[PDB]
A = this chain, B = another copy of it.
Protein backbone atom coordinates (compact mmCIF):
# COMPACT_ATOMS: atom_id res chain seq x y z
CA UNK A 1 0.00 0.00 0.00
CA UNK A 2 2.23 2.83 1.32
CA UNK A 3 6.01 3.53 1.38
CA UNK A 4 7.74 6.27 3.37
CA UNK A 5 9.42 8.87 1.18
CA UNK A 6 11.18 12.08 2.16
CA UNK A 7 7.73 13.70 1.76
CA UNK A 8 5.94 11.18 3.95
CA UNK A 9 3.82 8.13 3.01
CA UNK A 10 3.04 7.63 -0.67
CA UNK A 11 0.89 4.90 -2.26
CA UNK A 12 3.12 2.34 -4.00
CA UNK A 13 0.69 2.42 -6.95
CA UNK A 14 1.87 5.97 -7.59
CA UNK A 15 5.64 5.38 -7.55
CA UNK A 16 5.58 4.91 -11.31
CA UNK A 17 8.83 4.81 -13.27
CA UNK A 18 11.67 4.31 -10.75
CA UNK A 19 15.44 4.55 -10.55
CA UNK A 20 16.35 2.06 -7.82
CA UNK A 21 19.81 3.45 -7.04
CA UNK A 22 21.12 7.06 -7.42
CA UNK A 23 22.78 9.56 -5.00
CA UNK A 24 21.90 13.25 -4.85
CA UNK A 25 24.71 13.77 -2.29
CA UNK A 26 27.54 11.37 -1.45
CA UNK A 27 30.85 11.45 0.41
CA UNK A 28 33.22 8.62 1.33
CA UNK A 29 33.27 8.11 5.14
CA UNK A 30 36.02 10.40 6.36
CA UNK A 31 34.94 13.42 4.29
CA UNK A 32 33.61 14.93 7.51
CA UNK A 33 37.16 15.58 8.68
CA UNK A 34 38.07 17.61 5.58
CA UNK A 35 35.56 20.36 6.41
CA UNK A 36 37.98 23.26 5.87
CA UNK A 37 38.81 22.56 2.20
CA UNK A 38 35.74 20.44 1.47
CA UNK A 39 32.89 22.56 2.78
CA UNK A 40 29.27 21.84 1.86
CA UNK A 41 27.85 24.52 -0.46
CA UNK A 42 24.16 24.06 0.33
CA UNK A 43 22.53 26.38 -2.21
CA UNK A 44 24.70 25.31 -5.14
CA UNK A 45 24.27 21.63 -4.21
CA UNK A 46 20.54 22.15 -4.14
CA UNK A 47 20.63 23.71 -7.61
CA UNK A 48 22.63 20.73 -8.93
CA UNK A 49 20.43 18.12 -7.19
CA UNK A 50 17.27 19.80 -8.50
CA UNK A 51 18.65 19.80 -12.06
CA UNK A 52 19.42 16.10 -11.70
CA UNK A 53 15.83 15.52 -10.63
CA UNK A 54 14.55 17.53 -13.63
CA UNK A 55 16.75 15.48 -15.99
CA UNK A 56 15.26 12.27 -14.63
CA UNK A 57 11.75 13.72 -14.91
CA UNK A 58 12.35 14.49 -18.59
CA UNK A 59 12.63 10.78 -19.28
CA UNK A 60 9.55 9.99 -17.21
CA UNK A 61 11.14 9.01 -13.87
CA UNK A 62 8.73 9.73 -10.99
CA UNK A 63 10.58 8.04 -8.12
CA UNK A 64 14.19 7.71 -6.99
CA UNK A 65 15.61 5.50 -4.29
CA UNK A 66 18.63 7.31 -2.86
CA UNK A 67 20.36 4.74 -0.65
CA UNK A 68 23.14 7.04 0.70
CA UNK A 69 24.23 5.55 4.06
CA UNK A 70 24.11 7.36 7.41
CA UNK A 71 27.91 7.86 7.32
CA UNK A 72 28.12 8.94 3.66
CA UNK A 73 26.38 12.28 4.05
CA UNK A 74 22.70 11.18 4.09
CA UNK A 75 20.70 14.40 4.32
CA UNK A 76 16.93 13.68 4.40
CA UNK A 77 15.97 17.34 4.84
CA UNK A 78 18.05 18.26 1.79
CA UNK A 79 16.38 15.42 -0.11
CA UNK A 80 12.94 16.68 0.98
CA UNK A 81 13.80 20.13 -0.46
CA UNK A 82 14.68 18.59 -3.82
CA UNK A 83 11.44 16.59 -3.79
CA UNK A 84 9.27 19.51 -2.60
CA UNK A 85 10.62 21.61 -5.47
CA UNK A 86 10.38 19.01 -8.22
CA UNK A 87 7.52 16.67 -7.30
CA UNK A 88 9.88 13.69 -7.60
CA UNK A 89 9.32 10.96 -4.97
CA UNK A 90 12.56 10.23 -3.11
CA UNK A 91 13.01 7.26 -0.79
CA UNK A 92 15.99 7.34 1.58
CA UNK A 93 17.93 4.65 3.47
CA UNK A 94 19.05 3.71 6.96
CA UNK A 95 22.38 1.87 7.11
CA UNK A 96 26.17 2.13 7.05
CA UNK A 97 28.82 1.69 4.40
CA UNK A 98 30.90 -1.46 4.33
CA UNK A 99 34.35 1.69 11.99
CA UNK A 100 35.73 2.26 15.54
CA UNK A 101 32.35 3.43 16.90
CA UNK A 102 30.34 0.26 16.35
CA UNK A 103 33.50 -1.75 17.15
CA UNK A 104 33.62 -0.13 20.58
CA UNK A 105 30.00 -1.23 21.09
CA UNK A 106 30.91 -4.81 20.21
CA UNK A 107 33.12 -4.73 23.29
CA UNK A 108 30.13 -3.72 25.42
CA UNK A 109 28.20 -6.49 23.66
CA UNK A 110 25.32 -4.22 22.57
CA UNK A 111 26.37 -3.49 18.98
CA UNK A 112 23.87 -5.66 17.08
CA UNK A 113 20.96 -4.55 19.31
CA UNK A 114 22.03 -0.89 18.91
CA UNK A 115 22.04 -1.24 15.11
CA UNK A 116 18.66 -2.93 15.10
CA UNK A 117 17.42 -0.13 17.35
CA UNK A 118 18.79 2.47 14.96
CA UNK A 119 17.05 0.75 12.05
CA UNK A 120 13.72 0.53 13.92
CA UNK A 121 13.86 4.18 14.94
CA UNK A 122 14.67 5.44 11.46
CA UNK A 123 12.13 3.20 9.74
CA UNK A 124 9.23 3.70 12.13
CA UNK A 125 9.83 6.95 14.07
CA UNK A 126 12.03 9.32 12.11
CA UNK A 127 15.55 10.36 11.22
CA UNK A 128 16.92 12.74 13.84
CA UNK A 129 14.32 15.56 14.05
CA UNK A 130 13.59 15.65 10.30
CA UNK A 131 10.35 13.73 10.68
CA UNK A 132 11.44 11.63 7.69
CA UNK A 133 11.47 7.83 7.84
CA UNK A 134 13.74 5.71 5.67
CA UNK A 135 12.02 3.45 3.15
CA UNK A 136 14.88 0.97 2.83
CA UNK A 137 17.58 -0.61 4.96
CA UNK A 138 20.94 -0.32 3.25
CA UNK A 139 23.61 -3.02 3.70
CA UNK A 140 27.08 -3.47 2.30
CA UNK A 141 29.77 -6.11 2.33
CA UNK A 142 33.46 -6.10 1.45
CA UNK A 143 35.31 -7.59 -1.51
CA UNK A 144 35.33 -11.37 -1.21
CA UNK A 145 33.85 -11.42 2.31
CA UNK A 146 31.00 -10.45 4.55
CA UNK A 147 33.02 -9.63 7.66
CA UNK A 148 31.88 -10.22 11.25
CA UNK A 149 31.34 -6.48 11.56
CA UNK A 150 29.16 -6.47 8.41
CA UNK A 151 27.23 -9.59 9.50
CA UNK A 152 26.02 -7.65 12.58
CA UNK A 153 24.29 -5.22 10.22
CA UNK A 154 22.89 -8.06 8.11
CA UNK A 155 21.45 -9.77 11.20
CA UNK A 156 20.00 -6.50 12.52
CA UNK A 157 18.53 -5.71 9.08
CA UNK A 158 16.91 -9.12 8.91
CA UNK A 159 15.36 -8.54 12.37
CA UNK A 160 14.17 -5.09 11.39
CA UNK A 161 12.69 -6.35 8.13
CA UNK A 162 10.71 -9.04 9.97
CA UNK A 163 9.20 -6.37 12.27
CA UNK A 164 8.51 -3.70 9.64
CA UNK A 165 8.33 -5.30 6.23
CA UNK A 166 11.02 -2.81 5.16
CA UNK A 167 12.90 -3.26 1.88
CA UNK A 168 16.59 -4.17 2.06
CA UNK A 169 19.04 -2.95 -0.60
CA UNK A 170 22.63 -4.12 -0.65
CA UNK A 171 25.98 -3.06 -2.03
CA UNK A 172 28.28 -5.81 -3.28
CA UNK A 173 31.95 -4.92 -3.66
CA UNK A 174 33.65 -5.67 -7.00
CA UNK A 175 31.29 -8.43 -8.10
CA UNK A 176 31.53 -10.60 -4.98
CA UNK A 177 29.18 -12.07 -2.36
CA UNK A 178 25.87 -11.82 -4.23
CA UNK A 179 24.76 -15.37 -3.44
CA UNK A 180 26.26 -15.23 0.08
CA UNK A 181 24.36 -12.04 0.94
CA UNK A 182 21.09 -13.56 -0.24
CA UNK A 183 21.71 -16.80 1.68
CA UNK A 184 22.72 -15.15 4.95
CA UNK A 185 19.75 -12.76 4.89
CA UNK A 186 17.32 -15.65 4.27
CA UNK A 187 18.96 -17.75 7.01
CA UNK A 188 17.97 -14.97 9.34
CA UNK A 189 14.36 -14.84 8.19
CA UNK A 190 14.49 -12.00 5.67
CA UNK A 191 11.95 -12.13 2.84
CA UNK A 192 13.55 -12.49 -0.64
CA UNK A 193 10.69 -10.53 -2.20
CA UNK A 194 11.84 -7.51 -0.17
CA UNK A 195 15.56 -7.80 -0.99
CA UNK A 196 17.64 -6.16 -3.74
CA UNK A 197 21.22 -7.43 -4.15
CA UNK A 198 23.05 -4.49 -5.71
CA UNK A 199 26.01 -3.98 -8.06
CA UNK A 200 25.39 -7.34 -9.60
CA UNK A 201 26.69 -5.84 -12.87
CA UNK A 202 30.15 -5.87 -11.24
CA UNK A 203 30.37 -9.53 -12.23
CA UNK A 204 30.28 -10.65 -15.89
CA UNK A 205 29.58 -14.34 -15.19
CA UNK A 206 25.88 -15.11 -15.81
CA UNK A 207 26.07 -18.18 -13.51
CA UNK A 208 26.98 -15.89 -10.61
CA UNK A 209 23.75 -14.00 -11.33
CA UNK A 210 21.68 -17.15 -11.59
CA UNK A 211 22.94 -18.43 -8.21
CA UNK A 212 21.80 -15.13 -6.74
CA UNK A 213 18.49 -15.09 -8.62
CA UNK A 214 17.85 -18.66 -7.45
CA UNK A 215 17.10 -17.21 -3.97
CA UNK A 216 14.14 -15.30 -5.39
CA UNK A 217 15.66 -11.91 -4.62
CA UNK A 218 15.84 -8.91 -6.92
CA UNK A 219 19.22 -8.04 -8.40
CA UNK A 220 20.22 -4.60 -9.65
CA UNK A 221 22.38 -3.69 -12.63
CA UNK A 222 22.91 -0.33 -11.01
CA UNK A 223 26.36 0.84 -12.13
CA UNK A 224 25.59 1.72 -15.77
CA UNK A 225 28.10 4.30 -16.92
CA UNK A 226 30.94 3.34 -14.61
CA UNK A 227 33.91 2.05 -16.64
CA UNK A 228 37.54 1.45 -15.71
CA UNK A 229 37.51 2.25 -12.01
CA UNK A 230 36.99 0.07 -8.90
CA UNK A 231 37.61 -3.04 -11.02
CA UNK A 232 34.55 -2.19 -13.10
CA UNK A 233 33.53 -4.04 -16.27
CA UNK A 234 32.39 -2.02 -19.29
CA UNK A 235 28.79 -1.13 -20.26
CA UNK A 236 28.87 -3.65 -23.15
CA UNK A 237 29.60 -6.52 -20.75
CA UNK A 238 26.77 -5.28 -18.53
CA UNK A 239 24.41 -5.32 -21.51
CA UNK A 240 25.65 -8.73 -22.66
CA UNK A 241 25.03 -10.11 -19.16
CA UNK A 242 21.68 -8.38 -18.88
CA UNK A 243 20.70 -9.64 -22.36
CA UNK A 244 21.45 -13.23 -21.29
CA UNK A 245 19.25 -13.03 -18.18
CA UNK A 246 16.13 -11.48 -19.75
CA UNK A 247 16.17 -14.17 -22.43
CA UNK A 248 16.28 -16.72 -19.63
CA UNK A 249 13.15 -14.93 -18.43
CA UNK A 250 14.45 -13.09 -15.34
CA UNK A 251 12.78 -9.72 -16.04
CA UNK A 252 10.65 -9.88 -12.88
CA UNK A 253 13.78 -9.86 -10.68
CA UNK A 254 15.94 -7.18 -12.35
CA UNK A 255 16.19 -3.41 -11.94
CA UNK A 256 18.51 -0.87 -13.58
CA UNK A 257 20.25 2.32 -12.36
CA UNK A 258 23.54 4.26 -12.61
CA UNK A 259 24.65 4.80 -9.00
CA UNK A 260 25.41 8.45 -9.82
CA UNK A 261 26.84 10.84 -7.31
CA UNK A 262 25.44 14.20 -8.43
CA UNK A 263 27.09 16.19 -5.68
CA UNK A 264 30.30 14.95 -4.10
CA UNK A 265 30.84 15.80 -0.44
CA UNK A 266 34.29 16.77 0.78
CA UNK A 267 37.08 18.33 -1.29
CA UNK A 268 36.59 18.54 -5.10
CA UNK A 269 38.74 16.34 -7.32
CA UNK A 270 39.37 15.49 -10.97
CA UNK A 271 39.68 12.11 -12.64
CA UNK A 272 42.85 11.94 -14.80
CA UNK A 273 42.85 12.18 -18.59
CA UNK A 274 42.07 8.62 -19.70
CA UNK A 275 39.72 7.80 -16.79
CA UNK A 276 37.65 10.87 -17.15
CA UNK A 277 36.81 10.14 -20.78
CA UNK A 278 35.80 6.59 -19.98
CA UNK A 279 33.53 7.80 -17.20
CA UNK A 280 31.80 10.37 -19.38
CA UNK A 281 28.51 8.47 -19.58
CA UNK A 282 28.17 8.26 -15.77
CA UNK A 283 25.05 10.43 -15.51
CA UNK A 284 21.35 10.07 -14.76
CA UNK A 285 20.25 10.21 -18.42
CA UNK A 286 22.61 7.50 -19.68
CA UNK A 287 20.16 4.59 -19.34
CA UNK A 288 17.57 6.48 -21.33
CA UNK A 289 19.56 7.87 -24.25
CA UNK A 290 22.09 5.04 -24.72
CA UNK A 291 21.47 1.76 -22.90
CA UNK A 292 17.71 1.41 -23.39
CA UNK A 293 17.96 2.32 -27.11
CA UNK A 294 20.54 -0.48 -27.42
CA UNK A 295 18.29 -2.97 -25.62
CA UNK A 296 15.70 -1.89 -28.18
CA UNK A 297 18.00 -2.87 -31.04
CA UNK A 298 18.64 -6.31 -29.56
CA UNK A 299 14.86 -6.67 -29.48
CA UNK A 300 13.83 -6.16 -25.85
CA UNK A 301 10.10 -5.36 -25.82
CA UNK A 302 8.73 -2.28 -24.07
CA UNK A 303 6.54 -4.39 -21.78
CA UNK A 304 9.74 -5.95 -20.39
CA UNK A 305 11.38 -2.56 -19.76
CA UNK A 306 8.23 -1.46 -17.99
CA UNK A 307 8.43 -4.57 -15.84
CA UNK A 308 11.91 -3.60 -14.66
CA UNK A 309 11.18 0.15 -14.21
CA UNK A 310 7.58 0.08 -12.99
CA UNK A 311 6.29 -3.34 -12.08
CA UNK A 312 9.39 -4.44 -10.19
CA UNK A 313 9.68 -1.38 -7.93
CA UNK A 314 5.92 -1.56 -7.34
CA UNK A 315 6.09 -5.24 -6.36
CA UNK A 316 9.19 -4.64 -4.22
CA UNK A 317 7.63 -1.93 -2.04
CA UNK A 318 4.20 -3.63 -1.98
Contact = CB atoms under 8 A, between A and B. Distances in A.
A187 interface: no
A155 to B, nearest CB: 17
Contacts of A100: 28-30, 97
A281 interface: no
Interface stretch (A56-64, A110-118, A174-182, A202-210): A110-118
Interface residues of A, number: 42
Contacts of A272: 108
Contacts of A128: 35-36, 39
A27 B101 CA distance: 8
Nearest to A267: B114
Interface string A109-139: 0100010011001100111110000000000
A33 to B, nearest CB: 4
A30 to B, nearest CB: 3
B96 A28 contact: no
A307 interface: no
A31 B99 CA distance: 9
Nearest to A121: B36
Contacts of A267: 105, 114
A41 interface: no
Contacts of A29: 29-30, 99-101
Interface string A250-269: 00000000000000001101
B70 A33 contact: yes
A71 interface: yes
Contacts of A103: 28, 30
A32 B28 CA distance: 13
Q: Closest 9 A-B residue pairs measured CB to CB?
A: A30-B101, A33-B70, A33-B71, A28-B101, A28-B100, A31-B101, A35-B128, A36-B121, A28-B104
